[PDB]
Amino acid sequence: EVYAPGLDIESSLKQLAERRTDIFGVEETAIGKKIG
Amino acid sequence: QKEDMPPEHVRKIIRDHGDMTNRKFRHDKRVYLGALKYMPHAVLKLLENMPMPWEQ
Amino acid sequence: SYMLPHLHNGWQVDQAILSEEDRVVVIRFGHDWDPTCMKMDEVLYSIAEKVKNFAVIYLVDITEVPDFNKMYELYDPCTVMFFFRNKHIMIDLGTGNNNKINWAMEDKQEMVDIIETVYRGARKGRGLVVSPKDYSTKYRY
Amino acid sequence: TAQCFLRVDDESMQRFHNRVRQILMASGSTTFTKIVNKWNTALIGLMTYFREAVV
Amino acid sequence: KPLPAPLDGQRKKRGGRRYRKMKERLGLTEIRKQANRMSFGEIEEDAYQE
Amino acid sequence: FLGMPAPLGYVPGLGRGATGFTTRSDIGPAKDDEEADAIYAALDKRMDERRKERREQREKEEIEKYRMERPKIQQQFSDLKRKLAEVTEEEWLSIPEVG
RNA sequence: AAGGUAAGUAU
C-alpha cells in the first residue's frame, strides 16, 4: 500500500508527540520543545 | 585588571587588515565574523559621541 | 494523522528519489509538528489515495536529514520539491521561487491539478512547466 | 405638495456588493470576457432598477 | 478508485469505417455548423444582451 | 525505499548528482573558531539574562491561567484513555476492518 | 526588497 506500515505510523506519532508538547507530554513547554 | 594600549599597535593592525580581499586577514574566520553581529551597535556610539560645534 | 511514508535517514530519501520510474516523487520537506506543515501533510494524504498510480509522496524531516537543507535552500516550512525523473522540475505558479511550494494548498483539487500538470511536463521531457492558476495573488478579496 | 427623496436601501447595496464579491471570487480560471460581461449585467441591472437612487 | 494516469494522447493508428461510423455517430458536426465568427463592426444587439 | 539502512561512506548530496538551487543570496549560510563561537554565545546569553527570570515567570503564569480555561487536547479524554486499557485483548482483535 | 531564472543538449 501507499501508506506506511503500522510500526512506522506508531513511530511517527510517538515522534510527533515527543516534539510537539502542546497536546502531549507532562507539560506544555513549547511547540518545538525537545522536553515538555 | 586591564589597562589601555598605545594607538600605534591599533594603527598597525588596521593597516595590516586594510582589506579582506587578500589572504591576510582570512584566518580570522569565525572570530572576525563574531564581531560583525554587533556592527550596528558601534554605529550608535559614533552617532552619540560625535562632537558638538564647540568640541574642536 | 501523518501516516505517509517518512525518510528516517537522509540517504534513504536520496535513493528513494533515485528509485523512480515513470512516476513523480513529491518530497515534502519540513516537520510534522508544525501546524501549517500538518495541514500540508493532511492535504497530501487526501491526494495520495486518488493519484497513487503516478504520484508518490514521501515526507522527510529537516532535523532528521539536515544535509539537504542547504542543497535546495530548505529554510521555510511546508516546502515541496517535485523531484521527478531524477530532475528537479521548474514549476512556475507566479512566484519568485519557481521550484518550491512552501505553503499548504487551500484546496485538494488544485494540488491534484498541479501534480498532474507536473507529471505531464516531466513525461514530455521539459525541465520547466507553468501552472494553470497563478499564485501571485491569494484572491483574498 | 410633497417631495419623495429616495436612495438605494442598505440591504440592496449590501446585496449588490456581495454579488460583486461573488463575481470577483470566481476569477481563478474564468475567462476575462465572462467576468466583464457579469459586471456589465450587474451594473446594468442596478442602474435599470434604480437609476434615480444610484444618482 | 485512483484517478487514471493522464498519459499523452495517442491518435488512431488507422482510421477505420467503424471508427468513422463512431465519428459519424459522435463528434462535433453540429457544433461546426454554428459559426462562432464575430464581425469586427458592432452588432445590432446591445452591449449586454447575452 | 522506506525501512532500508543507509550505506555510509557516501555523501547523499554529491552521490545523487544534484545542482545547487541558488534561490537568492543572503538567504542561506552558504578549535579556535569553536572557542570563539562559545565565547560569543556566552556573551549573548549574558546579555539576554537581563530580563529572563521575570519574563519566564510571567509566561509561566499566563500559561497556567490559559490551561484552566482550556487544557490540552488529550486532557479532555484522560479518563477515557485511563479506562481504555480495560477493553479485552480479543475485543480490538476482532475489530471490523470494513467501514 | 520583491511577486520578471525558458527549458534541452554534451563540453
UniProtKB/Swiss-Prot annotation, chain A:
Phosphotyrosine, modified sites: 3
Tissue expression per record: Ubiquitously expressed.
Subcellular location: Nucleus; Nucleus speckle
Domain of life: Eukaryota
Assembly, per entry: Component of the 17S U2 SnRNP complex, a ribonucleoprotein complex that contains small nuclear RNA (snRNA) U2 and a number of specific proteins. Part of the SF3A subcomplex of the 17S U2 SnRNP complex which is composed of three subunits; SF3A3/SAP61, SF3A2/SAP62 and SF3A1/SAP114. SF3A associates with the splicing factor SF3B and a 12S RNA unit to form the mature 17S U2 small nuclear ribonucleoprotein complex (17S U2 snRNP). SF3A1 functions as a scaffold that interacts directly with both SF3A2 and SF3A3. Identified in the spliceosome 'E' complex, a precursor of the spliceosome 'A' complex.
Role of this protein: Component of the 17S U2 SnRNP complex of the spliceosome, a large ribonucleoprotein complex that removes introns from transcribed pre-mRNAs. The 17S U2 SnRNP complex (1) directly participates in early spliceosome assembly and (2) mediates recognition of the intron branch site during pre-mRNA splicing by promoting the selection of the pre-mRNA branch-site adenosine, the nucleophile for the first step of splicing.
UniProt free text on domains: SURP motif 2 mediates direct binding to SF3A3.
Protein name per its UniProtKB record: Splicing factor 3A subunit 1
Native species: Homo sapiens
Gene, per the UniProt record: SF3A1
UniProtKB/Swiss-Prot annotation, chain B:
Annotated coiled-coil segments of the chain: none
Tissues where this protein is expressed: Widely expressed.
Entry's localization field: Nucleus; Nucleus speckle
Top-level taxon of origin: Eukaryota
Subunit structure: Part of the U5 snRNP complex. Component of the U4/U6-U5 tri-snRNP complex composed of the U4, U6 and U5 snRNAs and at least PRPF3, PRPF4, PRPF6, PRPF8, PRPF31, SNRNP200, TXNL4A, SNRNP40, DDX23, CD2BP2, PPIH, SNU13, EFTUD2, SART1 and USP39. Component of the U5.U4atac/U6atac snRNP complexes in U12-dependent spliceosomes. Within the minor spliceosome, which acts on U12-type introns, interacts with PPIL2 and RBM48. Core component of U2-type precatalytic, catalytic and postcatalytic spliceosomal complexes. Found in a mRNA splicing-dependent exon junction complex (EJC) with SRRM1.
Described purpose of this protein according to its UniProt entry: Plays a role in pre-mRNA splicing as core component of precatalytic, catalytic and postcatalytic spliceosomal complexes, both of the predominant U2-type spliceosome and the minor U12-type spliceosome. Functions as a scaffold that mediates the ordered assembly of spliceosomal proteins and snRNAs. Required for the assembly of the U4/U6-U5 tri-snRNP complex, a building block of the spliceosome. Functions as a scaffold that positions spliceosomal U2, U5 and U6 snRNAs at splice sites on pre-mRNA substrates, so that splicing can occur. Interacts with both the 5' and the 3' splice site.
Gene source species: Homo sapiens
Section covered of the full-length record: 57 to 112 of 2335
Curated annotation (Swiss-Prot), chain C:
Outcome reported for the amino acid change (mutating residue 37 to A): Viable when expressed in S.pombe
Name of the gene: TXNL4A
Entry PTM: The disulfide bond seen in structures determined by X-ray crystallography and NMR is not essential for protein folding and function.
Compartments, as annotated in UniProt: Nucleus
Gene3D superfamilies: Glutaredoxin (3.40.30.10)
Keyword tags: Cell cycle, Cell division, Deafness, Disulfide bond, Mitosis, mRNA processing, mRNA splicing, Nucleus, Phosphoprotein, Spliceosome
Signal sequence, renumbered to the chain: none
Organism: Homo sapiens
SUPFAM superfamilies: Thioredoxin-like (SSF52833)
Modified residues (Phosphoserine): 131
PANTHER family with a match to the protein in the record: THIOREDOXIN-LIKE PROTEIN 4A (PTHR12052:SF5), THIOREDOXIN-LIKE PROTEN 4A, 4B (PTHR12052)
Name of the protein in its database record: Thioredoxin-like protein 4A
UniProtKB/Swiss-Prot annotation, chain F:
Mod. after translation: Phosphorylated by PRP4K during spliceosome assembly.
Places the protein is found: Nucleus, Nucleoplasm; Nucleus speckle
Tissue expression summary: Widely expressed.
Modified residues (Phosphoserine): 78
Disease: Retinitis pigmentosa 60: A retinal dystrophy belonging to the group of pigmentary retinopathies. Retinitis pigmentosa is characterized by retinal pigment deposits visible on fundus examination and primary loss of rod photoreceptor cells followed by secondary loss of cone photoreceptors. Patients typically have night vision blindness and loss of midperipheral visual field. As their condition progresses, they lose their far peripheral visual field and eventually central vision as well.
Function per UniProt: Involved in pre-mRNA splicing as component of the U4/U6-U5 tri-snRNP complex, one of the building blocks of the spliceosome. Enhances dihydrotestosterone-induced transactivation activity of AR, as well as dexamethasone-induced transactivation activity of NR3C1, but does not affect estrogen-induced transactivation.
Protein name per its UniProtKB record: Pre-mRNA-processing factor 6
Gene: PRPF6
